[PDB]
Coordinates of C-alpha atoms in Angstrom, one line a residue:
Chain A
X152 CA -91.4 -187.6 -202.9
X153 CA -91.3 -185.3 -199.9
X154 CA -88.2 -185.5 -197.7
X155 CA -87.7 -184.7 -194.0
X156 CA -85.4 -182.1 -192.5
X157 CA -82.0 -183.0 -191.3
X158 CA -83.1 -182.2 -187.7
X159 CA -85.8 -180.4 -185.8
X160 CA -85.0 -177.1 -184.1
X161 CA -85.8 -177.7 -180.5
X162 CA -86.5 -175.1 -177.8
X163 CA -83.7 -173.9 -175.5
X164 CA -84.1 -174.0 -171.8
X165 CA -82.1 -171.9 -169.3
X166 CA -81.6 -173.3 -165.8
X167 CA -80.7 -171.1 -162.8
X168 CA -79.8 -173.0 -159.6
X169 CA -79.0 -171.5 -156.1
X170 CA -77.5 -173.4 -153.2
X171 CA -77.3 -171.6 -149.8
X172 CA -75.8 -172.9 -146.6
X173 CA -75.1 -171.4 -143.1
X174 CA -73.3 -173.2 -140.3
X175 CA -72.9 -172.0 -136.7
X176 CA -71.4 -173.7 -133.6
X177 CA -70.4 -173.1 -130.0
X178 CA -68.0 -175.0 -127.8
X179 CA -67.6 -174.6 -124.0
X180 CA -65.4 -176.4 -121.5
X181 CA -65.3 -174.8 -118.0
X182 CA -64.9 -176.0 -114.4
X183 CA -62.5 -178.0 -112.2
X184 CA -61.9 -181.7 -112.9
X185 CA -60.9 -183.6 -109.7
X186 CA -59.8 -187.1 -109.2
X187 CA -62.5 -189.7 -108.6
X188 CA -60.6 -192.8 -107.6
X189 CA -57.9 -192.7 -104.9
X190 CA -56.1 -195.3 -102.8
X191 CA -57.6 -196.4 -99.5
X192 CA -56.3 -197.5 -96.1
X193 CA -54.2 -200.6 -95.8
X194 CA -53.4 -203.1 -93.0
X195 CA -51.1 -206.1 -92.7
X196 CA -50.2 -208.7 -90.1
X197 CA -47.3 -211.1 -89.8
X198 CA -46.1 -213.5 -87.1
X199 CA -44.0 -216.7 -86.5
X200 CA -45.5 -218.9 -83.8
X201 CA -42.7 -221.4 -84.1
Chain B
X152 CA -77.6 -195.3 -215.8
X153 CA -77.0 -192.2 -213.6
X154 CA -74.3 -192.4 -211.0
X155 CA -73.8 -190.6 -207.7
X156 CA -71.0 -188.3 -206.8
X157 CA -68.0 -189.6 -204.8
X158 CA -69.1 -187.4 -201.8
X159 CA -71.3 -184.4 -201.0
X160 CA -69.7 -181.1 -200.3
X161 CA -70.9 -180.2 -196.8
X162 CA -71.0 -176.8 -195.2
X163 CA -68.1 -175.7 -193.0
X164 CA -68.8 -174.4 -189.4
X165 CA -66.5 -172.1 -187.4
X166 CA -66.6 -172.3 -183.7
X167 CA -65.4 -169.6 -181.3
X168 CA -65.2 -170.5 -177.6
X169 CA -64.3 -168.2 -174.7
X170 CA -63.6 -169.2 -171.1
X171 CA -63.1 -166.6 -168.5
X172 CA -62.4 -167.0 -164.8
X173 CA -61.4 -164.7 -161.9
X174 CA -60.5 -165.8 -158.3
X175 CA -59.9 -163.6 -155.3
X176 CA -59.3 -164.5 -151.7
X177 CA -58.4 -163.1 -148.3
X178 CA -56.8 -164.6 -145.2
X179 CA -56.5 -163.1 -141.7
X180 CA -55.2 -164.5 -138.5
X181 CA -54.8 -162.0 -135.6
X182 CA -55.0 -161.9 -131.8
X183 CA -53.5 -163.6 -128.8
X184 CA -54.0 -167.4 -128.2
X185 CA -53.8 -168.2 -124.5
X186 CA -53.8 -171.6 -122.8
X187 CA -57.2 -173.0 -121.9
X188 CA -56.3 -176.0 -119.7
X189 CA -54.0 -175.6 -116.8
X190 CA -53.1 -177.8 -113.7
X191 CA -55.1 -177.3 -110.5
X192 CA -54.4 -177.5 -106.8
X193 CA -53.3 -180.8 -105.2
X194 CA -53.5 -182.3 -101.7
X195 CA -52.2 -185.5 -100.2
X196 CA -52.3 -187.2 -96.8
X197 CA -50.3 -190.0 -95.3
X198 CA -49.9 -191.6 -91.9
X199 CA -49.0 -194.8 -90.0
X200 CA -51.2 -195.5 -87.1
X201 CA -49.2 -198.6 -86.2

């Protein structure tokens, strides 16, 4: 004849979460940028024998 | 011969909910922004030997 409870009282849990992030960066661009591919010498010949 | 009730009178529950939020922000942009990439010196040579 005994009956159960409507529900059981559970235990409560507290959650504490921490997220930490640090970012650092450097960027350098120094100097002189010369050309590396340049035209060279040329030579041509032409003649009419007849 | 006993009969049930049409329904059972349940208990009424009042719920009070509070949501609070505060936002703050700053924004700064100060200084002098110079050019960092400029043209350099040039040199050229040309000749006809023949």
